[PDB]
Amino acid sequence: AVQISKKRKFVADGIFKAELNEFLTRELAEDGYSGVEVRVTPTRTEIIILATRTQNVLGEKGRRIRELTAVVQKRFGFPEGSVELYAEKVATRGLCAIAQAESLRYKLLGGLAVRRACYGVLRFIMESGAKGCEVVVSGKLRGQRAKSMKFVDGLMIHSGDPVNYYVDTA
Amino acid sequence: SQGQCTL
Amino acid sequence: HQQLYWSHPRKFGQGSRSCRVCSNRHGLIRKYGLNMCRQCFRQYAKDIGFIKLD
Amino acid sequence: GGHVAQIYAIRQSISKALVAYYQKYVDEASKKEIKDILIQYDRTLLVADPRRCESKKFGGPGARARYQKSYR
Amino acid sequence: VTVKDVNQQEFVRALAAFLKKSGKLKVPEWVDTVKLAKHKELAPYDENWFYTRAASTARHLYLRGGAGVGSMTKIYGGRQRNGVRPSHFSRGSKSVARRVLQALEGLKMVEKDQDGGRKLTPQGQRDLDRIAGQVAAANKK
RNA sequence: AUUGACAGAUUGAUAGCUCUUUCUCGAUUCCGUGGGUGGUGGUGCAUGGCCGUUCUUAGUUGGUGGAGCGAUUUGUCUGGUUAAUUCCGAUAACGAACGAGACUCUGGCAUGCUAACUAGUUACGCGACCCCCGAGCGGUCGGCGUCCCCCAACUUCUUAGAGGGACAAGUGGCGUUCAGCCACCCGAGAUUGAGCAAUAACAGGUCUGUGAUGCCCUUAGAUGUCCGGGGCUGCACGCGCGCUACACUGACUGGCUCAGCGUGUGCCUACCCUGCGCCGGCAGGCGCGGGUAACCCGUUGAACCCCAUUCGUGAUGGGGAUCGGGGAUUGCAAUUAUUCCCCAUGAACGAGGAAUUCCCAGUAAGUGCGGGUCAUAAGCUUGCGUUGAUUAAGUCCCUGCCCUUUGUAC
Ligand SMILES: [Mg+2]
Ligand SMILES: [Zn+2]
């Protein structure tokens, strides 16, 4: 890689973190996966997995972690010992909009009420502490045609530059 | 009746 | 057999140029060789580095 | 620049070059009178025009225009 | 005086006349049977186009040094009209002025540069300046 | 149990796919019964995702008070104003909140700062010259270097970090003297353009965007995957956006003077931008290099534009549709011509009835040139430029949206 241009390097790098971010979304469905932050160093890069069920992430002395370093090394063209992975816990789970989604998804898989789980995942946010939230579920449920309903309370601004970084969406 | 001029 | 199966030359082929997630042969983008559909980049643009400031 | 743009760029250049020299090295009373004469003739000799090219917006060949469309 | 304080059109015409009077510029075999530009629909209207274009080329080389075949073709481009299709841009031709720069080499007014291209020699610069002075003198009187 | 094959015939196939001949690998297959597969098949009237329109206008929701038996309403209003329930005022509303606004992206500036050889400026010691006595602190150089150097610094012009400046601030007028509207002076600019953009309604479109998907459908004579050829362009006729011009402000020939956004050698993927020099009438070919990039193209010498000659109202060198011949281009391949270069035939085209669309300032428009597309490519599209004016600062007359009063078994 002694002859690489910056523009195509960052283009392959942006899709590099996107490829792992999407893959770990598909992989750690039951581990409460939220996202990944990548630190790049010439010697040995490290990658952190943000999830709520970090104990299940390890499994058995990091069985899932060790098997993950092997597939990443084999697939992404990295040498032995060049990429190391760590597991972290979400500081404020309620304010991680991905978390309340993956709790709702498994509630839908279980068969919980549409309104009660929307208000339950809702009511969990102000007790953690938030200014506003809005969760919308649309589609078909034990019937014909697809219905969309929303559940929002509190100060909840959609329009403006502040909505770019103050709002996290899944 | 288009406001051309300025009873 | 081996002289017929996939015997069509794979180089210089548009359809043979396919995105690495969607495997679609209509509307491929190759800027910086991105190998990414226009709509598939539509959804991952905030991930790669593209944000609609303008 | 261009052709009319470059001529005016040069024309405004010598005008404010004389003004700057008449400001720094000679009597400022003459600097006021030459500036007043320049403003009286045409203000554009000293001011840079703010107006620039306006970015095109999709839906029509020009920036403000629209691609002619019919209902049927 | 330099070549800047004289009319460009009259300077080119005077240099073309001077080249015709000398008659030592190399003349290719294809004299009056080829087009000067790709975009053109006709042959050159007037003769001595070889001398007139060589006169202008020597002037462009005077202003900017280190110019080769690629540089020249960008300069002399012409408005290519393709009839029904929208018109586009066409670069200048290549071979004909290669005989011009070989003609200038034969007349000892261009010299190959250190990295590429052709650069004005003292003989060429001196000739261009004296004809410029003659042009200025003729314009004044 | 199998898979593959030379030989002779078909099939286009140097396709053991078949017919005669036999060879070669070996538990990995094959034959029936259950059972997943794949689909660019159908359903967008199952959908999830999104975008768009009502809508980019000015419009929508609690706590506490007021009106109500109540579902609910006032809060959001006679009036004035703005692009804008924004603001101001009479007022049962006060505090607020969503949406405008506000915020974010690019261009407008100090002789302000920081410092930029990957850039320039002024000079320095040169050389090439021009006039001329040896002339002159003469005039040009994008010709040399001021990162192994003392052989100097700086950022005005080339851009990248941070800060104010423009808020109806100051004068005058209109205005219930309030909100607001206009003239004016100083001012880079007295309305500079764009992204996000409240709930919700679309049976809006996409299953041909994904290994997102429900159900049904052909599954070993598959609607899969594999190969090849043909058409997606066909052609009597009508419909949308568009290009070329119908000329004299024109076109032809020759010269002269200016450009920025921006891509430029790739995991699987071979395929990059091009410079210099030579050959060829032209597309083009050959040898030599630079660039993984403010370092090369490139000071991007682009086009009408500025100058000189010709044609002079003649369907007239211009308008160039259709056809022939020759050649290189790209790949395996160009015929049902990707495209390009030269000689050719050279029809309409005197500005076009209704009837509509877009456009108010760097605007329209001319006119090009980048990127998206790509083995090669644009009459598409997004943008960047150069030239670049008048029309108006108004209303609902024609077509439609918003608000209220609101008939209404809806
Ligand atoms: Mg595709
Ligand atoms: Zn793909």
Swiss-Prot record, chain A:
Modified residues (N-acetylalanine): 1
UniProt domain KH type-2: residue ranges: 20-91
Residues spanning the membrane: none
GO biological process per UniProt: apoptotic process; base-excision repair; cell division; cellular response to hydrogen peroxide; cellular response to tumor necrosis factor; cytoplasmic translation; negative regulation of DNA repair; negative regulation of protein ubiquitination
GO molecular function, one term: small ribosomal subunit rRNA binding
Membrane topology: Peripheral membrane protein
Sites bearing Asymmetric dimethylarginine, chain numbering: 63-64, 66
Keyword set includes Signal: no
Modified residues (Phosphothreonine): 41, 69
Residues recorded with modification N6-acetyllysine: 61
Keyword DNA-binding: yes
Domain of life, source organism: Eukaryota
Modified residues (N6-succinyllysine): 131
Name recorded for this polypeptide: Small ribosomal subunit protein uS3
Organism the protein comes from: Mus musculus
Curated annotation (Swiss-Prot), chain C:
Cofactor section: Zn(2+)
N6-acetyllysine: residues bearing it: 46
List of residues that carry Phosphoserine: 7
Keywords tagged on the record: Acetylation, Cytoplasm, Endoplasmic reticulum, Metal-binding, Methylation, Phosphoprotein, Ribonucleoprotein, Ribosomal protein, Zinc
Modified-residue entries (Omega-N-methylarginine), positions: 10
First-listed, main subcellular location of the protein, grouped into a coarse class: cytoplasm
One cellular component (GO) term of this entry: cytosolic small ribosomal subunit
Transmembrane segments: none
Any one Pfam family match given in the protein's UniProt record, by short name: Ribosomal_S14
Keyword Methyltransferase: no
Record-level GO BP terms: cytoplasmic translation; translation
Record InterPro entries: Ribosomal_uS14 (IPR001209), Ribosomal_uS14_CS (IPR018271), RIbosomal_uS14_euk_arc (IPR039744), Ribosomal_uS14_sf (IPR043140)
Cofactor note: Binds 1 zinc ion per subunit.
UniProt-annotated binding residues for Zn(2+): 19, 22, 37, 40
GO molecular function annotation: structural constituent of ribosome; zinc ion binding
Compartmental location: Cytoplasm, Cytosol; Cytoplasm; Rough endoplasmic reticulum
Record's subunit section: Component of the 40S small ribosomal subunit.
Free-text function comment from the UniProt entry: Component of the small ribosomal subunit. The ribosome is a large ribonucleoprotein complex responsible for the synthesis of proteins in the cell.
PANTHER family tied to this protein: 40S RIBOSOMAL PROTEIN S29, SMALL RIBOSOMAL SUBUNIT PROTEIN US14
Similarity-based family: Belongs to the universal ribosomal protein uS14 family.
Name the UniProt record assigns to this protein: Small ribosomal subunit protein uS14
Swiss-Prot record, chain D:
Signal peptide range: none
GO biological process: cellular response to leukemia inhibitory factor; cytoplasmic translation; ribosomal small subunit biogenesis; rRNA processing; translation at postsynapse; translation at presynapse
Cellular compartment(s): Cytoplasm; Nucleus, Nucleolus
Single GO term (MF): structural constituent of ribosome
Keywords, in A-Z order: Acetylation, Cytoplasm, Nucleus, Phosphoprotein, Ribonucleoprotein, Ribosomal protein
Domain of life of the organism encoding this protein: Eukaryota
GO CC, alphabetical: cytoplasm; cytosol; cytosolic small ribosomal subunit; nucleolus; postsynapse; presynapse; ribosome; small ribosomal subunit
Similarity comment: Belongs to the universal ribosomal protein uS9 family.
Subunit structure, interactors included: Component of the small ribosomal subunit. Part of the small subunit (SSU) processome, composed of more than 70 proteins and the RNA chaperone small nucleolar RNA (snoRNA) U3.
Annotated protein name in UniProt: Small ribosomal subunit protein uS9
Species of origin: Mus musculus
Full protein: residues contained: 75 to 146 of 146
UniProtKB/Swiss-Prot annotation, chain E:
Post-translational modification N6-succinyllysine, affected residues: 140
SUPFAM superfamilies assigned to the protein according to its UniProt record, in alphabetical order: Winged helix' DNA-binding domain (SSF46785)
GO biological process, one term: ribosomal small subunit biogenesis
Modified residues (Omega-N-methylarginine): 64
Pfam family, one: Ribosomal_S19e
N6-acetyllysine carried by residues: 20, 108, 112
Subcellular localization: Cytoplasm; Nucleus, Nucleolus
InterPro entries in UniProt: Ribosomal_eS19, Ribosomal_eS19_CS, WH-like_DNA-bd_sf, WH_DNA-bd_sf
GO CC terms: cytoplasm; cytosol; cytosolic small ribosomal subunit; nucleolus; postsynapse; ribosome; small-subunit processome; synapse
The keyword Cell wall biogenesis/degradation is assigned to this record: no
Keyword presence, Ribonucleoprotein: yes
Chief location category: cytoplasm
Molecular-function annotations in GO: structural constituent of ribosome
Record keywords: Acetylation, Cytoplasm, Methylation, Nucleus, Ribonucleoprotein, Ribosomal protein
General function of this protein: Component of the small ribosomal subunit. The ribosome is a large ribonucleoprotein complex responsible for the synthesis of proteins in the cell. Required for pre-rRNA processing and maturation of 40S ribosomal subunits. Required for pre-rRNA processing and maturation of 40S ribosomal subunits. Part of the small subunit (SSU) processome, first precursor of the small eukaryotic ribosomal subunit.
Subunit composition and interactions: Component of the small ribosomal subunit. Part of the small subunit (SSU) processome, composed of more than 70 proteins and the RNA chaperone small nucleolar RNA (snoRNA) U3. Interacts with RPS19BP1.
Annotated family: Belongs to the eukaryotic ribosomal protein eS19 family.
Name of the protein described by the UniProt record: Small ribosomal subunit protein eS19
